[model samples]
Target: QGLDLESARLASAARHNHSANQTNEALRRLTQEGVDMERLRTSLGRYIMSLEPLPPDLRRALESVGINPFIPEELSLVDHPVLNFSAALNRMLASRQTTTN
Candidate 1:
């Protein structure tokens, strides 16, 4: 005879969703999005606890340019000026980029 349609398929799918499996999916997405998987996983709980662990030099550079990622900071600094968040972000993006090539 054939398998039961409802019970077996659903149970198998549920088993595939173990916590570690879910976390792996999340890690994959974050890595694809350019986040450092090693750094993020090492700081796992803290990163989830606070978004500010995103680093301040990047924040301040953006703040200097008036494009804060947080709504409160954005509102506070909108009328200020433009700072370069690119420098720090670039290091994360690539190991090197020559200014004059």
Candidate 2:
């Protein structure tokens, strides 16, 4: 004979935030998949700090041209320095192609 299954409120199985409607829901999705929120928070903070502060000469160089290094105009959400370097060279080649011909 079995007892009442409805009375139990134990932890359910599987992820909780399995899906989301927006990109900002990454935290929710990760949490549901067993990711520790505090770990992610601290990890991201350390990553940001690892970039180090900008040098005064470089900062002034950007500022002289009316650009702020702190709030860089070319800020990208997903592009890394390597990808940015690729784009820079790509644009330089494109510009040189025009002047050479």
Candidate 3:
């Protein structure tokens, strides 16, 4: 019972942080609890999918970093956005260049 309660608490907190776009902190919290990587990725993906729409400021921030979440595979890890966004963005840019040429 105690373990379950703690797990629930961690999940709730992680979801709250992730919804707020604090992806780094959400990943940290989930990692500390030994949550599975696949589960984390699925949860994040679903959460992102459920959001009404990305906020304008958030859209601009992602744009500044050269990413558009609308693009397919903008996330490589699917479950590791905190660690993968920049790398994925780089990959996306590289792919775009290759395609354009």
Candidate 4:
């Protein structure tokens, strides 16, 4: 259970890191930490493929940031800046603040 959570955390970190080197390092660390490459790969692959409609709470948060969750562009991975949920949320809030101010 703990390993699964930690593995996802590393995967998210790798996905969002700006530097390619850092992303690679994260993946290497994830491999070492998980030990089972297939398991980790499978888990991460499923997560990447499992996009769904935003939950009610997250949808409200998205609205507060001036985003329309119904849009296919917003829903799709294309043009998105971050894969980590918290990072994405923070980016949205910052973007909204800058636009309004």
Write down the worst ten-residue block by lDDT for model 1: 80-89
Mark the regions of model 4 whose C-alpha exceeds 4 Å error after superposition: 1-17, 51-75, 79-101
63-83 in candidate 3: lDDT tens per residue? 444444444444543654433
Candidate with top lDDT is: 3
lDDT of each: 0.41, 0.40, 0.45, 0.43
Model 1 CA lDDT for position 13 = 73
Query: Of models 2 and 4, which has the larger lDDT?
Result: 4
For TM-score, candidate 3 versus 4, the one ahead is 4
lDDT tens per residue, model 2, 27-68:
344456454445434433333344555455434533443333
Q: Model 3, clash count?
A: 1
Model 4 lDDT per residue over 1-101, tens place? 35688877888777742453443344345345443334333433333455444445434433443333344445565443224432333344456455453
* Minimal lDDT window, size 10, model 3: 16-25
Q: What is the C-alpha RMSD of each candidate to the true structure, in Å?
A: 15.1, 17.5, 15.0, 18.0
Better of 1 and 4 by TM-score: 4
Better of 3 and 4 by lDDT: 3
TM-score of each: 0.26, 0.29, 0.26, 0.33
Global fold similarity of model 1 (TM-score): 0.26
Residue 66 error, candidate 4, Å: 26
lDDT of 1 by residue, 1-101 (tens): 87688887888777732233333344345556555644543333232334445455434433343344343454443332211222233343344434455
Candidate 3: residue 34 lDDT (0-100) = 59
Local lDDT at 91 for model 1: 42
Off by over 4 Å in 1: 1-20, 45-101
- Please tell me which model should have the higher lDDT, number 1 or number 3: 3
